Structure formats: C-alpha cells, structure tokens
C-alpha cells in the first residue's frame, strides 16, 4: 500500500477511536447478511436465519474481534502485506475455499461500518485512505 | 432481485433521505473520485476540484434519477430507458465503476443516517443500487 | 372464506382467493393524476413510491369511485381513507400476483379535492412504521 | 436485462437445443468439475468421476430448469421461485460459481450448435445466463 | 389510423395507438391449455416459450373465440392462423407496452381440437426465421 | 501456470491447428459485442455500432491478430508469465485504464472461439488446461 505520511496519520488516528469489541462484529455480520452466500463459510458458527439473529450471534461477534485485529496488524506492514497475510492467504484458499472477490466485500463492508460509526468524521480523504488499505489487505489474501 | 421487504426498506429509507438526497448525491461523487481516481476519466469535461458546482449540481441529477429508479422498483427498465440509452449505448461506463459509486452511496447514507442505516436496510440498498447499475449498463 | 377488511390489513385481505388475478374495468371511467403530500407540505415519498399514477375514477351511478394501484401490498397493514373528517369504505377489488399490486377502491363526492390516508406497513423480523398522515391531492376535482 | 432482440435470440437458439438440452447440461457440469475443481465441493455427496450417472441425471434437470427459464424470460423470479429457495437460502451457492457453469454452458453450445453460435446470439445466452444467476442467487 | 393486420405483421400493428394498453375482458369465458407442436411431432419451443398459457376461450354468439397473448410482439412478423385448411381472421384487441404482450383474437368451430399456425420472426440486423408449422393443440375441445 | 507435460502436450497441440489470422478477430469482436462497454477502449477503431460492422472490422481484425500472438507468446514462458506481460500490464493499467476483470472476460471469450472452431476435439480435459493458461494470462496483466 502506497500512502503519503498524512494519510498513515489520518489513518491512524481515526483507527486509534474505533471501538475493536464493536465494529467487528458489525463489519462480519452485515458481510452474512448483505452478502447471504457468505453464510455458507460460517455455518459452524449456528443460526444466521435473520437479520437479528447474525448481529447477536456471540461466535459473529468473537471472530469479527478476530478480523479487525487482523486489519490492526495490517496498518502495521503496509509495505509488506503479501507476507504478513501469507499464513491467512493460505487458509482461505487451500482449506476454506473462499473466493477472491469476497475479499474486497468485507473490505467495503468494514468502510461502511467506519463511516456508520464516524458519521462527518468519516470524510472522503479518510475514505479514500481507507480504500487503499482495504484494497491492500483484499490483495494480499488473494496472493 | 429484490423482496417485497427489500423494496420496503428501501422505499421507507429514501423517504427519510428527503430533500438531502441532492447533498448524499454529490457526497457519493466526491468519494467515488477521490477514492477511485480512474474514474474521473469519465468526467474530463468536469472541473473535478473538490466543491465543484458541476460535481454538487450533477450529484442532484444523480440523486433525482435515483428517486426516479426506488419510485418505479418494480419495472426500473421503463423508468430509467433514457439514462441506459446514455450509460450503456452512449457512455459504454465499464460496469466496475457503478460497484464503485453504489459503494459510495452506501458510505455517505451511513454517515448522514445511521439511525436507518441498519444491517436489513443496508442488505436492501446495495440489492437495490446492483439491479439500478444493470439496467444502466445493459442495452435493452 | 371470511378475509381482514383492505383498512385493517391490506397484506391478508390480499390472499383471498376470490380477488387474486380477478378483472377489474369499469364501464365509464377516466385517468386521473394525483401526488402525495405529508405533514411538513413535502412529497410523501413512501406512498408516491408505493401507488400506480395515474388512478382511475370510476362513474357509478352512487356517485364517483377512485381505484388507487397500491404497490409491495404483502407489506401494507393499515390503509385508512379519509374525506375531509369522516371515514371511507375501501375494497379490495383485486390483487396482482404476479408484481404484488392490490387495486383498491373508495367512494369521494363530487368536487372533491384531497383525501386524507392514515396508513402502516408491517414485513419482515418485527419491523413496523406508521404512517399518520399522507394527502393525496387530485389533479383536478372529482366529478360524476 | 434482456432486449426483445435478446429475448428471441435464446428461444430461437434454445429451440434448435431441443432434445440434446440434457446432453449439453450434463457435459458444461463436466466442464465445470474440470476446469474449476473448487465447485465440486458443492457436490460431495456425488461421485464426480466422467460419465458419473449422478452428472449426467443432474445436467438433465439443470437443462430442463434452463428450458423452464427461457420460455418464462420475462419473470424469472416466479418461475425459478422453488430455485431461488435451494440455491440462494438453502445451498446458499457463491454467485462466482454461477458465472463459471454459465461460460461452460456457453462453451458447450458452441462446440455442438457452431452455425447458431453467432456473436449476436453468444451476446443473449450470456446476458440471459447472468440474469438467471441473479435470480437463483438472490433472496426475494 | 390504418395498421398492417396481425397476420402481416404484428410488430407494426402493435404500434397502432387504439390498442396500446387497452382493456380487453370478456363477459363470458373460460380458461384453456395448449400445447405448441412442431412438424416432427417435438414440442415447439419457440412458441411454447412465446405464449401465454392458459389462453382464454371467449364466447360470442357467433361462436367461440380464443383469446392469445404473444411474447416479444415486437419481434413476431407473420402469424397466420389456419383451422384445418381455411385461414382464420386474427385480429388485434390489445398490446401491453410494458411486457411486449400482444394479445390476438380468432374464432374456431365447435368441437375445434387443433389450429394450424404459419409464422415467422423479423428483427435486429436483418435477422429473418420462418416458422412454416406449428401446431396449437388444445387440452380439450372447443366449446360454446 | 502449473501445468503437467501432457497438459502442455495437448494444448500446444491444438494451438498448431488454430487459424491465428481468423480466431483473434472472432474472440476479440466477440468481446466487443457480448461484453458492449469493451467498445469504450477500441473507439479509434471506428464503427462499432452493430455486430456485423464489428466483426467485418479490418482493424479488429488486424488487432485480434496482436492479441493471439500475445497469447502465443504467453503458451512459451509458462514458468514466467508476469515477467513476459509485464510491458503489456502497465500499458493496460497507466495508459488505457482497463479494469482486471475485462482480461478474464477476453480469456473466456478466446475458449468459446476455441471452442466453436474445434467442437467435440475441444474435450473437457482440453478445455480445462486452456482454462489455466488464459487465468494465468489474465492474472499476469493484473500484476
Ligand atoms: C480482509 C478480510 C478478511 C480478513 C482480514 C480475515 C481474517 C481472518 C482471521 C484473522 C481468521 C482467524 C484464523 C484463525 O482462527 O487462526 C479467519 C478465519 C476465517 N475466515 Fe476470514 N478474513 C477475511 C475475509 C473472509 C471472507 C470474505 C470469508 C468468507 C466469506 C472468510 C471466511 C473465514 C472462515 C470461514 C474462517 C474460519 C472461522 C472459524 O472456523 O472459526 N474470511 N479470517
Ligand atoms: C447510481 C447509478 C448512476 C445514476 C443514477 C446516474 C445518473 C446520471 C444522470 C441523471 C445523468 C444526467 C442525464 C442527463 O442530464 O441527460 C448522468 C450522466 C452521466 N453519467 Fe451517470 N449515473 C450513474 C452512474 C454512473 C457511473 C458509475 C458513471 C461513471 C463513473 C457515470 C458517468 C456519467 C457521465 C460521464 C455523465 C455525463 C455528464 C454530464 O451530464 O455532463 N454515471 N448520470
Ligand atoms: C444455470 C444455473 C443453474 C441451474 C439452472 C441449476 C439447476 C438446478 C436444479 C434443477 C437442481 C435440482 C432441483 C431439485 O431437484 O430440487 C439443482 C440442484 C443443485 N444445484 Fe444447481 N443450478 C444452477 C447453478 C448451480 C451452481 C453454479 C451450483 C454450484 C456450483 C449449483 C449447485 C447445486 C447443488 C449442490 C444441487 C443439489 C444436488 C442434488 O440435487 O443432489 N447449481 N440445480
Ligand atoms: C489477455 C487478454 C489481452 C491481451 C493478451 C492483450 C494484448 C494486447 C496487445 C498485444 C496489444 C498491442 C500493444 C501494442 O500496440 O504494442 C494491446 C493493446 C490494447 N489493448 Fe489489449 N490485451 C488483452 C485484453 C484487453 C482488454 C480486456 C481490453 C479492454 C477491454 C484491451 C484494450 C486494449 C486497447 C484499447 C489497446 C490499444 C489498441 C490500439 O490503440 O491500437 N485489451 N493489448
């Protein structure tokens, strides 16, 4: 990811305000249910039959806190994604079988949890170094 | 396709939009061209500067054609024959970039209405911003 | 064989098998354009989204009837048709399968102008909004 | 969304498939297995070997939902209602699959019907399959 | 005001602004199926896939009528039908301009259990088929 | 592209029997035509309004060509596909701003040429293997 040192700043700081117990499992669960096909990976995870049902799913919530410390990660290494995602790349590739294109889903799924969450604060210079980091992390998985 | 609920949701979020839906319109632009710079290689004739009264008075149209498209959900290739006419015969717009805006869109309703902005009513709009991006796209 | 009145709850007076897919033209009637207006003078959106334009008013000779297209029916629930302060009879005369449209109708008196609509919707996991207030404001005065 | 030219290009196409509809189900199903293993793990209650009894059954009610689809291409989403159930509630299928079989399909009818396979009528089938995967992969 | 008939060409008579989007119910009918056959005794696909099933029987008292809607009417050319040898009149009633349903009427004998229809299609860049037969077959015999 | 020897047997085979002045015009056109905003990148080409004025394009034609030998180049230097298509890549991303998915599109269109030329000797196994190559390709003018 190429980003000039105010949008590493801009980045940072609006990451050091996000509430990682919460937007997780916002980010996931509005993943199963905007894009119901991805409930399909998460059937160990039990009943994803409504809307209400995903969003109060503990084991939603657990793995979301999972996926965005993964993120947390990634904003550290952002000159070497393709190495720091290797072992996960792997994983949703040999053993779950996830679809390259799902990746970017959640990336834009997790955006608009930011901006939900953000609202104004959200602006579209934030965003947009958003995108270029969750366009990064999509990339590195499907290496 | 969308659902019974799924046109409800969306109707019922619209609504709450309102006389705002020139704002978000133009909002979504904004975003769109600074966050996917390739796509203002379609907007050469626009001064792309950020506060550009072309980009704030063309988000209205695009916010107007967009209430124009949730008012006739049910039969969108009649409503929106003119607008496909341009994107998809005219334009030939590459597909990706109608994700793009649709993306956008949802980020910038997020931000202004987050009360509505639930995860059933997010489902709904991104269902519904998908059918509106094929029928611009596609010569009929 | 008994079925909710299309007031009460549109959405189950619509699975009555006696007005599913059944024709509903009328011997005299006209085209008529209207708009949805809400409390604050805006465009109701909900409704306009929601209603066939142009309705039609239908010639009786009890006086003029309009029938309204009401689109997404599965999820209307109240539809309460006022004119002026006193409440109208609405039938359900038909139900569109096949796009989820109910046609329903109501009696207005001559010159008549507005009518007022107290309406709800009611889908999904518990999801239910009121609607107190729409007027639907005829492109002319109702007459025959 | 399908044009009246697109619409006449597939039922006229589709009817020169005619008994051998069967036949080319079952032999994009092969394709498929083959050329993209990751969509066998949806059939590991088959025994997906060449020639398996199981495929050539199952390309026979893929091609008879494909013919069901067709002669109602102007509401799909009533007609492959029952579909839409198994495939986007129950199976809940990755949309990327569907645009795989689609190209076997098409694959498939230009190896056996070269004469009908004109640029003109390959542009329907394509369109045509792509809104056929939209209705089985969508929940209304 | 004059329109080529819908034997012709019904892609030019559906343009004919007296039938766009008319009514067209009957007082007395009934529904009918059909099956579409081709000449090798195979169901005809492209008619099958271009016709409303069921169609409607009307009666008159000039005999029985059946009623057929045709899909992509845009598209159809020529679409004579023939009971047995002599060439039926098909006339227009009515073109629904949202779907592209053209639907045409022709009458039939008592006891009609079978109609002949000569056809073709014509659109897009000269693209030009002719079906020479195709067989309507009626689930039962024509009554009233 | 990880291909075994007698998939590259098979493939190189059926490559020596292709009509390489005719099946690039046809898979090219096709793209035009079946996949329409494509005509947005070839508008120098001139008349692109119908599918014959496509198709009878002389410079469609005469490009096809260039996209064939591009990928005949590809069939050589399976090892070293991103290395190859390198030029090509960045002339696609920087110049004409083509989105990676249309290269995928291109791809599977070359197979149903493939496909139309060769009827039942283009077999599933054959197929299969063809499906690798223009992925590979594909991806490597992604990188
Ligand atoms: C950039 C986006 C994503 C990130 C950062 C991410 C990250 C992770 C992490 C950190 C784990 C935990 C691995 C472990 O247990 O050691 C995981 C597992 C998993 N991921 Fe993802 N993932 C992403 C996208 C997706 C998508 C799109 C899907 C499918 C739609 C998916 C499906 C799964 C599944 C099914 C598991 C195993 C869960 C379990 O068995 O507990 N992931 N991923
Ligand atoms: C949500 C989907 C979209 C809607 C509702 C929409 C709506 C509109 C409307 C209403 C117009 C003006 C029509 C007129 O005045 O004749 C327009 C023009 C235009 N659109 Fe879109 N659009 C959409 C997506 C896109 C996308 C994705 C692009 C490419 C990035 C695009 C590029 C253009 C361009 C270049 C014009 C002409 C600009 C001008 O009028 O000066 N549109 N669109
Ligand atoms: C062209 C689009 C498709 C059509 C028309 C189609 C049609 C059908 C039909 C008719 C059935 C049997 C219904 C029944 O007997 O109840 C079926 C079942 C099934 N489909 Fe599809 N399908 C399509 C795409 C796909 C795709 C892309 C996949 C995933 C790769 C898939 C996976 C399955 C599975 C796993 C079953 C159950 C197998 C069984 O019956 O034992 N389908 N489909
Ligand atoms: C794997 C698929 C593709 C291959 C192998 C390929 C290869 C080539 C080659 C060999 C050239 C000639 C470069 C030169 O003049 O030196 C070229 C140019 C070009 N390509 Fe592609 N290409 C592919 C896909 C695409 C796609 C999908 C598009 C857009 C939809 C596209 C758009 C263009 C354009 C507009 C030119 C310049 C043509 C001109 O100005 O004469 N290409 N490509």
């Given at each position: 990811?190429?980003?000039?040192?105010?949008?590493?700043?801009?980045?940072?700081?609006?990451?050091?305000?996000?509430?990682?117990?919460?937007?997780?499992?916002?980010?996931?669960?509005?993943?199963?249910?905007?894009?119901?096909?991805?409930?399909r990976?998460?059937?160990?995870?039990?009943?994803?039959?409504?809307?209400?049902?995903?969003?109060?799913?503990?084991?939603v919530?657990?793995?979301?806190?999972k996926?965005?410390?993964?993120?947390?990660?990634?904003?550290?290494?952002?000159?070497?994604?393709?190495?720091?995602f290797?072992?996960?790349?792997?994983?949703?590739?040999?053993k779950?079988?996830?679809?390259?294109?799902?990746?970017?889903?959640?990336?834009?799924?997790?955006?608009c949890?930011?901006?939900?969450?953000?609202?104004?604060?959200?602006?579209?210079?934030?965003?947009?170094?958003?995108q270029?980091?969750?366009a990064?992390?999509?990339?590195?998985?499907?290496? | 396709?969308?659902?019974?609920?799924?046109?409800?949701?969306?109707?019922?979020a619209?609504?709450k939009?309102?006389?705002?839906?020139?704002?978000?319109?133009?909002?979504?632009?904004?975003?769109?061209?600074?966050?996917?710079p390739?796509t203002?290689?379609?907007?050469?004739?626009?001064?792309?500067?950020h506060?550009?009264?072309?980009?704030?008075?063309?988000?209205?149209?695009?916010?107007?054609?967009?209430?124009?498209?949730?008012?006739?959900?049910?039969?969108?290739?009649?409503?929106?024959?003119?607008?496909?006419?341009?994107?998809?015969?005219?334009?030939?717009?590459?597909?990706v970039?109608?994700?793009?805006?649709?993306?956008?869109?949802?980020?910038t309703?997020?931000?202004?209405?987050?009360?509505?902005?639930?995860?059933?009513?997010?489902?709904?709009?991104?269902?519904?911003?998908?059918?509106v991006?094929?029928?611009?796209?596609?010569?009929? | 064989?008994?079925?909710?009145?299309?007031?009460?709850?549109?959405?189950?007076?619509?699975?009555?098998?006696?007005?599913?897919?059944?024709?509903?033209?009328?011997?005299?009637?006209?085209?008529?354009?209207?708009?949805?207006?809400?409390?604050?003078?805006?465009?109701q959106?909900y409704?306009?989204?929601?209603?066939?334009?142009?309705?039609?008013?239908?010639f009786?000779?009890?006086?003029?009837?309009?029938?309204?297209?009401?689109?997404?029916?599965?999820?209307?629930?109240?539809?309460e048709?006022?004119?002026?302060?006193?409440?109208?009879?609405?039938?359900?005369?038909?139900?569109?399968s096949?796009?989820?449209?109910?046609?329903?109708?109501?009696?207005?008196?001559?010159?008549?102008?507005?009518?007022?609509?107290?309406?709800?919707?009611?889908?999904?996991?518990?999801?239910?909004?009121?609607?107190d207030?729409?007027?639907?404001?005829?492109?002319?005065?109702?007459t025959?």
């Amino acid at each position: 990811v190429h980003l000039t040192p105010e949008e590493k700043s801009a980045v940072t700081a609006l990451w050091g305000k996000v509430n990682v117990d919460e937007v997780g499992g916002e980010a996931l669960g509005r993943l199963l249910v905007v894009y119901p096909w991805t409930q399909r990976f998460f059937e160990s995870f039990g009943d994803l039959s409504t809307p209400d049902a995903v969003m109060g799913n503990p084991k939603v919530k657990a793995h979301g806190k999972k996926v965005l410390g993964a993120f947390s990660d990634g904003l550290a290494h952002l000159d070497n994604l393709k190495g720091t995602f290797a072992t996960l790349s792997e994983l949703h590739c040999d053993k779950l079988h996830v679809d390259p294109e799902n990746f970017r889903l959640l990336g834009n799924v997790l955006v608009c949890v930011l901006a939900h969450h953000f609202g104004k604060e959200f602006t579209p210079p934030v965003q947009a170094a958003y995108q270029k980091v969750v366009a990064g992390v999509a990339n590195a998985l499907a290496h | 396709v969308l659902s019974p609920a799924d046109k409800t949701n969306v109707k019922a979020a619209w609504g709450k939009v309102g006389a705002h839906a020139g704002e978000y319109g133009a909002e979504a632009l904004e975003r769109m061209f600074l966050s996917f710079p390739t796509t203002k290689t379609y907007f050469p004739h626009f001064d792309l500067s950020h506060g550009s009264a072309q980009v704030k008075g063309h988000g209205k149209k695009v916010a107007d054609a967009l209430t124009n498209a949730v008012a006739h959900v049910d039969d969108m290739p009649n409503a929106l024959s003119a607008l496909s006419d341009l994107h998809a015969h005219k334009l030939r717009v590459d597909p990706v970039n109608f994700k793009l805006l649709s993306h956008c869109l949802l980020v910038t309703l997020a931000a202004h209405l987050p009360a509505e902005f639930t995860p059933a009513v997010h489902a709904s709009l991104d269902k519904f911003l998908a059918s509106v991006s094929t029928v611009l796209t596609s010569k009929y | 064989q008994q079925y909710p009145p299309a007031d009460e709850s549109l959405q189950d007076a619509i699975k009555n098998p006696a007005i599913i897919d059944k024709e509903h033209t009328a011997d005299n009637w006209r085209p008529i354009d209207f708009q949805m207006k809400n409390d604050k003078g805006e465009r109701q959106f909900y409704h306009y989204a929601s209603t066939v334009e142009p309705a039609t008013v239908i010639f009786t000779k009890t006086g003029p009837i309009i029938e309204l297209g009401l689109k997404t029916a599965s999820t209307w629930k109240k539809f309460e048709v006022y004119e002026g302060d006193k409440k109208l009879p609405v039938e359900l005369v038909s139900y569109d399968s096949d796009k989820d449209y109910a046609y329903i109708r109501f009696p207005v008196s001559n010159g008549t102008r507005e009518v007022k609509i107290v309406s709800s919707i009611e889908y999904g996991e518990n999801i239910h909004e009121d609607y107190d207030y729409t007027l639907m404001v005829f492109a002319q005065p109702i007459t025959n």
